[PDB]
Enzyme design. Structure first.
Site, PDB file in Angstrom:
ATOM      1  N   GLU A  25      36.798  41.857  22.280  1.00 28.44           N
ATOM      2  CA  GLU A  25      36.307  43.020  22.987  1.00 28.44           C
ATOM      3  C   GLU A  25      35.913  42.596  24.393  1.00 28.44           C
ATOM      4  O   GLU A  25      35.532  41.447  24.611  1.00 28.44           O
ATOM      5  CB  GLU A  25      35.130  43.647  22.244  1.00 28.44           C
ATOM      6  CG  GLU A  25      35.505  44.235  20.894  1.00 28.44           C
ATOM      7  CD  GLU A  25      34.330  44.883  20.198  1.00 28.44           C
ATOM      8  OE1 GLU A  25      33.195  44.373  20.333  1.00 28.44           O
ATOM      9  OE2 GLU A  25      34.540  45.905  19.513  1.00 28.44           O
ATOM     10  N   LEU A  90      37.473  44.402  37.326  1.00 30.84           N
ATOM     11  CA  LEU A  90      38.393  45.220  38.103  1.00 30.84           C
ATOM     12  C   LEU A  90      38.146  46.676  37.743  1.00 30.84           C
ATOM     13  O   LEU A  90      38.592  47.149  36.698  1.00 30.84           O
ATOM     14  CB  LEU A  90      39.845  44.795  37.835  1.00 30.84           C
ATOM     15  CG  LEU A  90      40.157  43.399  38.399  1.00 30.84           C
ATOM     16  CD1 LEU A  90      41.485  42.847  37.893  1.00 30.84           C
ATOM     17  CD2 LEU A  90      40.127  43.463  39.919  1.00 30.84           C
ATOM     18  N   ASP A 132      54.444  39.551  28.973  1.00 35.95           N
ATOM     19  CA  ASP A 132      53.995  40.861  28.511  1.00 35.95           C
ATOM     20  C   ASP A 132      53.720  41.767  29.704  1.00 35.95           C
ATOM     21  O   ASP A 132      52.702  42.461  29.755  1.00 35.95           O
ATOM     22  CB  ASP A 132      52.751  40.736  27.611  1.00 35.95           C
ATOM     23  CG  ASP A 132      52.514  41.977  26.760  1.00 35.95           C
ATOM     24  OD1 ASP A 132      53.441  42.811  26.628  1.00 35.95           O
ATOM     25  OD2 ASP A 132      51.392  42.122  26.221  1.00 35.95           O
ATOM     26  N   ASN A 137      48.891  45.981  31.575  1.00 37.42           N
ATOM     27  CA  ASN A 137      48.412  44.650  31.960  1.00 37.42           C
ATOM     28  C   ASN A 137      48.421  44.449  33.469  1.00 37.42           C
ATOM     29  O   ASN A 137      48.389  43.323  33.966  1.00 37.42           O
ATOM     30  CB  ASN A 137      49.259  43.566  31.277  1.00 37.42           C
ATOM     31  CG  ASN A 137      49.010  43.501  29.785  1.00 37.42           C
ATOM     32  OD1 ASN A 137      47.942  43.889  29.318  1.00 37.42           O
ATOM     33  ND2 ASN A 137      50.002  43.020  29.025  1.00 37.42           N
TER      34      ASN A 137
HETATM   35  C1  LIG Z   1      36.396  55.746  32.215  1.00 38.35           C
HETATM   36  C2  LIG Z   1      36.841  54.789  31.180  1.00 38.35           C
HETATM   37  N1  LIG Z   1      38.293  54.686  30.892  1.00 38.35           N
HETATM   38  C3  LIG Z   1      38.582  55.022  29.500  1.00 38.35           C
HETATM   39  C4  LIG Z   1      37.578  55.816  28.720  1.00 38.35           C
HETATM   40  C5  LIG Z   1      38.765  53.346  31.246  1.00 38.35           C
HETATM   41  C6  LIG Z   1      38.480  52.208  30.286  1.00 38.35           C
HETATM   42  N2  LIG Z   1      38.590  50.853  30.786  1.00 38.35           N
HETATM   43  C7  LIG Z   1      37.537  50.243  31.552  1.00 38.35           C
HETATM   44  O1  LIG Z   1      36.493  50.861  31.821  1.00 38.35           O
HETATM   45  C8  LIG Z   1      37.723  48.799  32.053  1.00 38.35           C
HETATM   46  C9  LIG Z   1      37.440  48.309  33.319  1.00 38.35           C
HETATM   47  C10 LIG Z   1      36.879  49.100  34.493  1.00 38.35           C
HETATM   48  N3  LIG Z   1      37.761  46.995  33.345  1.00 38.35           N
HETATM   49  C11 LIG Z   1      38.237  46.602  32.140  1.00 38.35           C
HETATM   50  C12 LIG Z   1      38.680  45.235  31.775  1.00 38.35           C
HETATM   51  C13 LIG Z   1      38.830  44.176  32.663  1.00 38.35           C
HETATM   52  C14 LIG Z   1      38.331  43.975  33.954  1.00 38.35           C
HETATM   53  O2  LIG Z   1      37.631  44.697  34.611  1.00 38.35           O
HETATM   54  N4  LIG Z   1      38.767  42.751  34.391  1.00 38.35           N
HETATM   55  C15 LIG Z   1      39.543  42.151  33.408  1.00 38.35           C
HETATM   56  C16 LIG Z   1      40.229  40.874  33.356  1.00 38.35           C
HETATM   57  C17 LIG Z   1      40.949  40.526  32.223  1.00 38.35           C
HETATM   58  C18 LIG Z   1      41.002  41.397  31.125  1.00 38.35           C
HETATM   59  F1  LIG Z   1      41.696  41.044  30.043  1.00 38.35           F
HETATM   60  C19 LIG Z   1      40.324  42.643  31.163  1.00 38.35           C
HETATM   61  C20 LIG Z   1      39.594  43.002  32.324  1.00 38.35           C
HETATM   62  C21 LIG Z   1      38.236  47.699  31.297  1.00 38.35           C
HETATM   63  C22 LIG Z   1      38.684  47.733  29.844  1.00 38.35           C
HETATM   64 CL   LIG Z   2      36.278  46.484  41.446  1.00 40.97          CL
END
Ligand SMILES: CCN(CC)CCNC(=O)c1c(C)[nH]c(/C=C2\C(=O)Nc3ccc(F)cc32)c1C
Ligand SMILES: [Cl-]
Ligand SMILES: [Cl-]
Length: 287
Positions: A25, A90, A132, A137
Site C-alpha cells: 500500500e 507526485l 510495464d 505507471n
Molecule cells: C483524488 C484521489 N484519486 C482517486 C480517488 C487519486 C488517487 N491516487 C493518489 O492520490 C496518489 C498520489 C497523489 N500519489 C500516489 C502514489 C505515488 C506518488 O505520489 N509517488 C509515487 C512513486 C512511486 C509509486 F509507486 C507511487 C507513487 C497516489 C496513489
Molecule cells: Cl507534486
C-alpha cells in the site's frame, strides 16, 4: 539490500493511505528534515512470499536510477515485519487518472509522450527495461512534471545477458516477443509505448474489452494495432513506428524524441497542470 536502512519514523512521518500498491500500500508521508511530502510504499514481508524477489528487484533498480524522469528514490527502511520504500511524492496522480474526465488533445498527448520517452531513453541507456509501460505507471507532479514509476518487473541487461525472456508486464500493453517469451530487449518498451500512445489518444488500449488471456493469442496472431479515428497523420505514424512486429524495425526512444509528432506538438510540461485541474474538478463533482 546493502544500503538498507532502519528506524524510518525518526526521519519520516507516515500519513494517510493514498493508494495501491504494487506489493503493498502507498501512504502519503513527510520528510521531517525538509518538510517535503513523500510517498511511502509499505510491504508486509511476512506475507510477501512469492513477490519477494520482485520487491528486491524494484529496490535494486530504483536505487540505481538517478533521473528527473524516474520516481526519485529516498531509500528502503526495515521496521519489524515491514519494508518502507520511500519515494518522490507526485501529487498529480497518474496519466490514467487524468484520462478519466475525457479525451486529451494532441498537445497533451505529445507532451506526455515526450517525457515518457526521456525516461525510456535514460533507462535504456542504463541497460534497463521497464517492461510495464502503460498510462497507470506514468505519474505527474501537481505542476505537470512527468516520471515513470513501478519497477517491480523491470529487467536488467548485462555484458553476459544481452536479452531478457521473462513473461512479465500487462497483457494489453505487452510486445509480441514478450508474450512468446522470445529473447527481447528495450525494444519491448517501445511497443508498449506505442500501445500507451493509443491509450492516451483513445482512452484505452486495443482489445481493452476482451479477457486478457484472449489477447495473449490475439497480439502475436494479428497485424499490429493502428490508431484509428480523426488524429493527425504524424500521431498515426508515431504509433505505427512503435508497433512493428519486428523489434529491430522499431525506433529507439532517442529517435522517437525527434519524431515529427513530438516536435510539432509537445509544449511546456507546466501546461499539463490544466489536466490536473480538470481531474480535480471532475473528481470533486463525481457522485
Ligand atoms: C483524488 C484521489 N484519486 C482517486 C480517488 C487519486 C488517487 N491516487 C493518489 O492520490 C496518489 C498520489 C497523489 N500519489 C500516489 C502514489 C505515488 C506518488 O505520489 N509517488 C509515487 C512513486 C512511486 C509509486 F509507486 C507511487 C507513487 C497516489 C496513489
Ligand atoms: Cl507534486
Ligand atoms: Cl503481423
Amino acid at each position: 539490500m546493502q544500503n538498507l536502512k532502519a528506524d524510518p519514523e525518526e526521519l519520516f512521518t507516515k500519513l494517510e493511505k493514498i493508494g495501491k500498491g504494487s506489493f503493498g500500500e502507498v501512504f502519503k508521508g513527510i520528510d521531517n528534515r525538509t518538510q517535503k511530502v513523500v510517498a511511502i510504499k509499505i510491504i508486509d514481508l511476512e506475507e510477501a512470499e512469492d513477490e519477494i524477489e520482485d520487491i528486491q528487484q524494484e529496490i535494486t533498480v530504483l536505487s540505481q536510477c538517478d533521473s528527473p524522469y524516474v520516481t526519485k528514490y529516498y531509500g528502503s527502511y526495515l521496521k519489524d515485519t515491514k519494508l518502507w520504500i520511500i519515494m518522490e511524492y507526485l501529487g498529480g496522480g497518474s496519466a490514467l487518472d487524468l484520462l478519466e474526465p475525457g479525451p486529451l488533445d494532441e498537445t497533451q498527448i505529445a507532451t506526455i509522450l515526450r517525457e515518457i520517452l526521456k525516461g525510456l531513453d535514460y533507462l535504456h541507456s542504463e541497460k534497463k527495461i521497464h517492461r510495464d509501460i502503460k498510462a497507470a505507471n506514468v505519474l505527474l507532479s501537481e505542476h505537470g512534471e512527468v516520471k515513470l514509476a513501478d519497477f517491480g518487473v523491470a529487467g536488467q541487461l548485462t555484458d553476459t545477458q544481452i536479452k531478457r525472456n521473462t513473461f512479465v508486464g500487462t497483457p494489453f500493453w505487452m510486445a509480441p516477443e514478450v508474450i512468446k517469451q522470445s529473447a527481447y530487449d528495450s525494444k519491448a518498451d517501445i511497443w508498449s509505448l506505442g500501445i500507451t500512445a493509443i491509450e492516451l489518444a483513445r482512452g484505452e488500449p486495443p482489445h481493452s474489452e476482451l479477457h486478457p488471456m484472449k489477447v495473449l493469442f490475439l497480439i502475436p496472431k494479428n497485424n499490429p494495432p493502428t490508431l484509428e479515428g480523426n488524429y493527425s497523420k504524424p500521431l498515426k505514424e508515431f504509433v505505427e513506428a512503435c508497433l512493428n512486429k519486428e523489434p529491430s524495425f522499431r525506433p529507439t526512444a532517442k529517435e522517437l524524441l525527434k519524431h515529427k509528432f513530438i516536435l510539432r506538438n509537445a509544449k511546456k510540461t507546466s501546461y499539463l497542470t490544466e489536466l490536473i485541474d480538470r481531474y480535480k474538478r471532475w473528481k470533486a463533482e463525481q457522485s
